[PDB]
Design a protein around this nucleic acid. Sequence first.
DNA 1: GGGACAGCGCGTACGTGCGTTTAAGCGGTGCTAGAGCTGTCTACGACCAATTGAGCGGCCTCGGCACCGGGATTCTCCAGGG
DNA 2: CCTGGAGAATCCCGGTGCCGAGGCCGCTCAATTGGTCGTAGACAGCTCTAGCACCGCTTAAACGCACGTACGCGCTGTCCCC
Lengths: 87, 95, 86, 97, 99, 126, 97
Amino acid sequence: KRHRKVLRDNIQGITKPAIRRLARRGGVKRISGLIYEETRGVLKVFLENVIRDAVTYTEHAKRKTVTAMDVVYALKRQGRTLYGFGG
Amino acid sequence: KGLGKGGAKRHRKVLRDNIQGITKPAIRRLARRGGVKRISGLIYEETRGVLKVFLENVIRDAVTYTEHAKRKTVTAMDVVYALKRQGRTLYGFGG
Amino acid sequence: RHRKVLRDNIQGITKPAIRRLARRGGVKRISGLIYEETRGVLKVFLENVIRDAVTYTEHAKRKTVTAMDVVYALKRQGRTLYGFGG
Amino acid sequence: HRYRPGTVALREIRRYQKSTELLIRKLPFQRLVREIAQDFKTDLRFQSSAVMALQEASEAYLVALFEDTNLCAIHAKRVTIMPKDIQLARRIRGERA
Amino acid sequence: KPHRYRPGTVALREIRRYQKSTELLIRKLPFQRLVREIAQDFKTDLRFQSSAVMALQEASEAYLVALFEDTNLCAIHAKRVTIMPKDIQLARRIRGERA
Amino acid sequence: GKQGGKTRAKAKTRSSRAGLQFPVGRVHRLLRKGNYAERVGAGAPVYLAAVLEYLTAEILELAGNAARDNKKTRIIPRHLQLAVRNDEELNKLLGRVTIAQGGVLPNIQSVLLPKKTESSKSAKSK
Amino acid sequence: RRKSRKESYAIYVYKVLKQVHPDTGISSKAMSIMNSFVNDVFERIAGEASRLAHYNKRSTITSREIQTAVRLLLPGELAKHAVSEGTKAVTKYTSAK
DNA sequence: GGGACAGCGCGTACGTGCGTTTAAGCGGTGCTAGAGCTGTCTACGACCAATTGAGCGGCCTCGGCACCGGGATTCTCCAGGG
DNA sequence: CCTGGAGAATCCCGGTGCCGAGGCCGCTCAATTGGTCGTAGACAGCTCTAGCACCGCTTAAACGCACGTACGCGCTGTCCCC
């Protein structure tokens, strides 16, 4: 395989009602058009930063698959801790 | 013009003036240091409450650290530990 | 006060540089997306040639790359350059 | 002669930023620091360094808060900063926790 | 109007300059840094003779101009005066330079 | 290690062998005092001292650069604060860290200027 | 006996400052800022190195953990430069003697 | 406090398309099922650091005083008035 | 025209020099052990093929959910003395 090299292609097509449900979960009632693009960007930026610790932990263990334990170590480092997926 | 004429006070401390000593100009300079153009009249009483809460949280750990050391003096090392845990770590007091 | 490690390495080929080469082809105006693409196609073209050029230089056991190695790289790639000869 | 409102504020903005000083008066702060710790522990002694350290953290925390509340005011259309901005800033920054 | 030459017509004046003159249309020093930079990825600790850099530029000038000339025929076929990266990507594929 | 020779007292300091400035023996002296781990290898004290030196040198160089702009040959904590709050990579670190007797950068917003929602002005930096 | 040793990095910081800038002085008050900055960063890196060993069932600390800790703390340019400085230090040690 | 002052906060009537189920058909990514070696920490032996204190002598810092640049008035021009 | 900040001559901050102090950084040996380099024997995870009904994904679209537009005050901003 390995036919894909550049990351120009984007597969980040987050669904609009999913954003509406996420927004309405937090108490939002009127969502504008420009909100959707940055909502994906905020998720992308958050995912980019948390994954930086995950790869560093994974490479230290010489692993090929990221385990849930490594995610908890990465997540708890950034202040956002998840319970039930590690320990 | 002569004498107090109204509002004069010659009663310093005596279980008072501890938190009211941060007068309006004192709050203004702190606001100007961060950068403001105009502040409401309600910000003065709110600022005193905001400052007290931050001081209370830090001093609560500091006295706890002091008691564990079996000493009566409170040093800059005790308070900086409270700030470090809270996240507002302060440099320049390491000795 | 100071900016970081480097700049203008690949962005040094600004709009006039592409436009002058565009005016060489006869065209009048371009879309805005060519400038990023022209830098990209330049990068892959140089990488193909420079990979061949350094390969000759390594075989010569020297730290300097001469035009002879570049000509050999270009001649084999179908982009033979008759200039800069002996 | 007479400085219209807002004229001196801009000058004072450009002055306090480049200065190195403590904006809380020294004597009232010592009394405040002793009193709050007095109820927690009765017999206490305070070093001069601790008082200086507490003031710097308290001032910088308020200064940092003022910057955020200033950006809370620009979110609205009012130059003035109301308690609406401070309370909202505390919740977002996690202070009310 | 302040005697502004038409944006379409300014090309024609620029046409006659490049169609009559022989020159190099890429800045030398920025190209010098770029050529030295791409070397580090493949082979570090390398020097570069001035003739080698100029020869690399000469290939680049002919590479892009030939690309520009052929892409113009792609635009003339697409009913649009302007060339587009749509045509350039096609031009690389047909010329065999895409892969 | 069969090293009986001319010198048996002190050949070189462990940090002085490579040429470092911050000593590495002191780092290894009380490394196990803090209960980080046991059986610390030789690589960690050398790596930790070097990265600390790089961080220390960079701040000092930038502080000196800020000092020159202020016509001062002494590094006042204001100079250190300017260096910290001038790089995005340095901005993430010490985000909420307080510097004693330091300062804050002279920032201003557009609407504070006399012209409402406008900050054109004339030649003033930032 | 006032022999109590205070592990202060002021002398080492001063020597580094002198090497990069012989003509630039350092204030006495500003020395404590660097001394506390070094201690805080030292605890941060050492704390990360300790956690890595516990997670990986390792009872030893070497240059790999510090390099992992540096990448987990410093951002892009800072990490790659610190790693380069850190990598050069261990390699020179094996041959310096 | 007391008027003008500029948008944008609701809600119309109407187009534009993406959304969650429903059969069904060739695959994916962990668990085993095995072994051969790397990592990883146990014993040795003549010593290597780097730590702990002590006499001597030569060196570094706040003080003051000359400068040259920053704080004050008195005119020069960019700000709404004729 | 004053407004309210900026420039060249007087005045306040960083510098240099010399003294005895008494601890610090630089070597200096002692003594049992202790990490890195070789082997040990045991099981864990990483790649590639299997079973049989799930799961995600795209168009079939015509009623209702909100940003653009005009109105209306209604709150706030600033200028003026003690």
